[PDB]
C-alpha cells in the first residue's frame, strides 16, 4: 500500500500509553468494521523487541482516498485532544516489508477441557489426563487491551511483526488491520 | 522565624460522591426518574457495570461546596508563622482575587474531566450546573464539555460568571453550593467506568458511583506551570507535582519549584515568587494537606 498516516499518542499523565493505544486500536477496529474491506494495513514503527514494547506511534497503510475519508469520520471524535495527526504521504524508497500477525496461545487448559469435553462427551478426569497443565504457552509479544461491546469480554491481543523481507506479495487484512498475506512497508 | 512543626489545612471545594444513572438522550431535562447503573458480577469473577440496552446516556451527579477562608490553617504550633502566612495570603488576595484559580476551576467544571474513562470515546457530553441558594435553584449554566478542550483555558461569558461565583465563594463573601449533572452519550449496552475498591467497583446503595476524591483530583487539574514542559497540559496541584500513571514527578526538589521551597521562600524569607508560582502555592493551600516536620 502506497499511502501511510502516522498518528502519535500525545503523552498523557491522565492516561497511560498502553491504555491510549488500546482505545485507539479499538476505535480503529470499529472504523475498519464500519468501512469493511481487506486492503487496510497497520504498523508500529516504534518497536522495541527487547522489552516487548509497542512504543507511541501508529502507522496506517492504505490509499490516499481511504486515509482522507478516515480522517473525517467520527472514529476520531472524542480522541483528537489525545493524539497528534500526520499527513497521508507516500512510502519512501527503498523500504523493507514485514507482516502484522495475531499470535494467540492455548494458555488456558480450561478452554481445551471444554472443547474436548463438549465434542467427545468425555469426563473431566479424561480431559485432565488427555491435556495436562503444562500446555500453557508463554509469550514475549507486545499487546493492546480490548473490550467487547455486545457480549462483554476482556482479552489481550498479541501483535507479532514478522521477518523483514525484500519484496511484498498480495494478500488481505482483517478489521483489526493485521496481515492475512499482505505486508506493510517497515520504516 | 521558622516554619511550624504541625500545620494542617482543611480542603476547600468539597465534592460529594458522584452517582451514576442511565437514560435516553433528549430525556435529559426529564432525568429525575432515571434508573441507576447497577453493578453486576460475571465470570475469575469480575464486577462490571453497563448501561441498559435501551439507554445510551450516562448521567453522573454530584454536589460541590465552595467555602472560603483558604489561608487559615486548621492547626498550627507557631503563632508568628501563622500571622506571617495569614498576612502573606492577605497581600496575595489584595494583589489579585481568586479569579485565575476560580477560572481554571470553572474550566475543570465546564469540561467533564471528572468522567475519567467515561468521557473518552463519547460522541457528546453536556454539563448542567445549578447554583442552589435556598432549597430551590438560583442559576443554571449549560456547557458543551466537548467544546471546552482539556488543553487550553478559554474564555466565555457564562464561564466567567461561574468563575466569579466560585471566586466569591473562595473569598468568603458568600456560601456556594453547586449541583453538577453530566450527560455522556456512549451507546446502548456499553460499559461505564466507576471507581474500583481494594476486582470490585465502588457503590453507594444499589448504584455505581465515583469516589469523591476522584472528582476532587479531576477538579484541581489546573497546574500549567511545571518547569519540565507545558505541551502536555495541566496536571493536578501537588507538592512535588507528580502523577501515578507516568511514574514521574515534576516539581522535583532539586529544581527550586516544588511547593515546599516556594512556601518557605515566600513566607519566611519574603522571596515572593512568580505570579504563576503564587497561583500554584495558593492552589496547593486550597487543596489542603499536612505540611510541616
Grid cell, residue B229, equals 514542559
Answer for the pair A182, A62: CB distance below 8 angstroms, yes or no. no
The end-to-end CA distance of chain B, in Å, is 15
HSE of B273 in the Cβ direction (CA atoms, 13 Å)?
21
Backbone phi, psi, residue A151, to 5°: -110, 115
Grid cell, residue A28, equals 480503529
B189: nearest CB among A13, A74, A150: A150
**Same domain? B161 vs B238:** no
- Best B152, B214, B233, B240 member to test A by mutation, with max A CBs in 10 Å, is B233
**Same domain? B279 vs B167:** no
Distance CA B180, CA B113 (A): 12
In chain A, which residues have their Cβ closer than 8 Å to the Cβ of B122?
78
Is B245 within 8 Å of A14 when comparing Cβ atoms?
Answer: yes
Identify how the structure was determined.
cryo-EM
How many contacts does A have with B, using Cβ atoms within 8 A? 45
Strands B75-76 and B18-23: unpaired
**Same domain? B113 vs B236:** no
| Domain residue limits, chain A | 3-104+137-185
Question: Sheet harboring A100-102: ordered strands across?
Answer: A100-102, A155-161, A143-146
Which of these, B256, B252, B263, B250, lies nearest to B224 by C-alpha position? B250
Nearest CA in chain B to A26: B121
- CATH architecture type of domain A3-104+137-185: 2-Layer Sandwich (3.30)
**Same domain? B140 vs B65:** yes
Which of these, A153, A149, A187, A151, lies nearest to A168 by C-alpha position? A187
Inter-CA distances, B41 with A114, A165, B45, B53, B279, Å: 22, 48, 7, 17, 45
**Same domain? B85 vs B165:** no
Residues contacting residue B20 through CB under 8 Å, at least 6 positions apart: B36, B37, B49, B58, B59, B60, B192, B194, B207, B208, B209, B210
Is B232 within 8 Å of A15 when comparing Cβ atoms?
Answer: no
How long is chain B? 293
Answer for the pair B139, B257: CB distance below 8 angstroms, yes or no. no
Grid cell, residue A117, equals 469435553
Distance CA B222, CA B107 (A): 9
User: Is the peptide bond between A94 and the residue preceding it cis, with omega within 30 degrees of 0?
Assistant: yes
Residue B168: other Cβ atoms inside 10 A: 18
A29 is catalytic: yes
DSSP string, B246-261: TTEESS-TTTTTSHHH
Residues contacting residue A35 through CB under 8 Å, at least 6 positions apart: A66, A69, A70
CB-count burial class (<10 Å; 0-12, 13-18, 19+) for B78: middle
The SS3 call for residue A115 is helix
Distance CA B201, CA B198 (A): 9
**Same domain? B207 vs B241:** no
**8-state DSSP, A91:** P
**Same domain? B104 vs B246:** no
**Same domain? B107 vs B184:** yes
DSSP string, B208-227: EEE-HHHHHHHHT--B---S
**Strand pairing partners for A8?**
A57, A84
Answer for the pair A182, A170: CB distance below 8 angstroms, yes or no. yes
At which of B168, B200, B221 does a domain end? B221
Grid cell, residue B204, equals 453507594
> Is some CB atom of chain A closer than 8 A to the CB atom of B154?
no
At which of B160, B189, B221 does a domain end? B221
Answer for the pair B111, B150: CB distance below 8 angstroms, yes or no. yes
- Cα–Cα–Cα angle for B183, B184, B190, nearest 5°? 135
**Same domain? B201 vs B146:** yes
Nearest CA in chain B to A14: B245
R_g of chain B, CA atoms, integer Å: 20
Grid cell, residue A23, equals 482505545
Distance CA A35, CA B107 (A): 37
Answer for the pair B34, B146: CB distance below 8 angstroms, yes or no. no
Residues contacting residue B264 through CB under 8 Å, at least 6 positions apart: B3
At which of B171, B187, B221 does a domain end? B221
**Same domain? B150 vs B169:** yes
Is A15 within 8 Å of B120 when comparing Cβ atoms?
Answer: yes
**Same domain? B249 vs B153:** no
User: By residue range, what is the domain housing residue B239?
Assistant: 1-10+70-97+222-293
- Cell 434508573: give the residue: B35
**Same domain? B75 vs B126:** no
Strands A155-161 and B289-290: unpaired
Number of independent structural domains in chain B: 2
Amino acid at each position: 500500500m502506497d499511502h501511510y498516516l502516522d498518528i502519535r499518542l500525545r503523552p498523557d499523565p491522565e492516561f497511560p500509553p498502553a491504555q491510549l493505544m488500546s482505545v485507539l486500536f479499538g476505535k480503529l477496529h470499529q472504523a475498519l468494521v464500519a468501512q469493511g474491506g481487506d486492503r487496510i494495513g497497520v504498523s508500529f514503527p516504534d518497536l522495541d523487541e527487547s522489552r516487548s514494547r509497542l512504543g507511541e506511534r501508529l502507522r496506517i497503510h492504505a490509499s490516499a482516498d481511504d486515509l482522507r475519508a478516515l480522517l473525517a469520520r467520527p472514529w476520531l471524535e472524542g480522541l483528537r485532544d489525545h493524539l497528534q495527526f500526520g499527513e497521508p504521504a507516500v512510502v519512501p524508497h527503498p523500504t523493507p516489508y514485514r507482516q502484522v500477525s495475531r499470535v494467540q496461545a492455548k494458555s488456558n487448559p480450561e478452554r481445551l477441557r471444554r472443547r474436548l469435553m463438549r465434542r467427545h462427551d468425555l469426563s473431566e478426569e479424561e480431559a485432565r489426563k488427555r491435556i495436562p497443565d503444562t500446555v500453557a504457552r508463554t509469550l514475549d509479544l507486545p499487546f493492546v487491551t480490548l473490550r467487547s461491546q455486545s457480549t462483554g469480554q476482556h482479552f489481550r491481543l498479541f501483535i507479532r511483526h514478522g521477518p523483514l523481507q525484500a519484496t511484498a506479495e498480495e494478500g488481505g487484512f482483517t478489521c483489526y488491520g493485521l496481515s492475512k498475506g499482505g505486508f506493510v512497508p517497515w520504516f | 522565624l521558622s516554619t511550624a512543626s504541625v500545620l494542617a489545612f482543611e480542603r476547600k471545594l468539597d465534592p460529594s460522591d458522584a452517582l451514576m444513572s442511565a437514560g435516553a438522550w433528549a430525556q435529559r431535562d426529564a432525568s429525575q426518574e432515571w434508573p441507576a447503573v447497577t453493578v453486576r458480577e460475571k465470570s475469575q469473577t469480575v464486577d462490571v457495570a453497563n448501561l441498559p440496552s435501551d439507554a445510551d446516556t450516562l448521567k453522573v451527579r454530584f454536589t460541590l461546596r465552595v467555602l472560603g477562608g483558604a489561608g487559615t490553617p486548621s492547626a498550627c504550633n507557631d503563632a508568628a508563622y501563622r500571622d506571617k502566612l495569614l498576612q502573606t495570603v492577605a497581600t496575595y488576595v489584595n494583589e489579585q482575587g481568586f479569579a485565575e484559580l476560580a477560572r481554571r476551576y470553572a474550566h475543570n467544571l465546564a469540561n467533564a474531566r471528572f468522567l475519567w474513562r467515561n468521557r473518552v470515546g463519547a460522541e457528546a457530553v453536556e454539563v448542567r450546573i445549578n447554583h442552589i441558594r435556598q432549597g430551590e435553584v438560583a442559576r443554571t449554566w449549560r456547557f458543551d464539555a466537548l467544546a471546552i478542550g482539556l488543553r487550553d483555558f478559554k474564555a466565555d461569558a457564562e464561564l466567567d460568571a461561574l468563575a466569579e461565583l466560585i471566586a466569591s465563594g473562595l473569598s468568603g463573601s458568600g456560601h456556594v453550593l453547586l449541583e453538577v449533572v453530566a450527560f455522556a452519550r456512549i451507546g446502548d449496552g456499553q460499559e461505564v467506568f466507576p471507581s474500583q475498591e481494594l476486582k470490585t467497583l465502588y457503590s453507594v446503595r444499589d448504584a455505581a458511583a465515583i469516589h469523591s476524591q476522584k472528582i476532587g483530583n479531576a477538579l484541581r487539574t489546573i497546574d500549567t506551570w511545571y518547569p519540565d514542559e507545558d505541551g502536555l497540559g495541566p496536571i493536578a496541584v501537588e507538592p512535588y507535582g507528580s502523577v501515578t500513571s507516568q511514574g514521574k514527578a515534576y516539581r522535583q526538589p532539586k529544581q527550586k519549584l516544588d511547593f515546599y521551597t516556594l512556601l518557605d521562600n515566600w513566607v519566611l524569607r519574603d522571596e515572593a515568587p512568580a505570579v504563576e508560582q503564587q497561583h500554584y502555592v495558593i492552589a496547593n493551600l486550597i487543596r489542603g494537606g499536612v505540611f510541616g516536620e
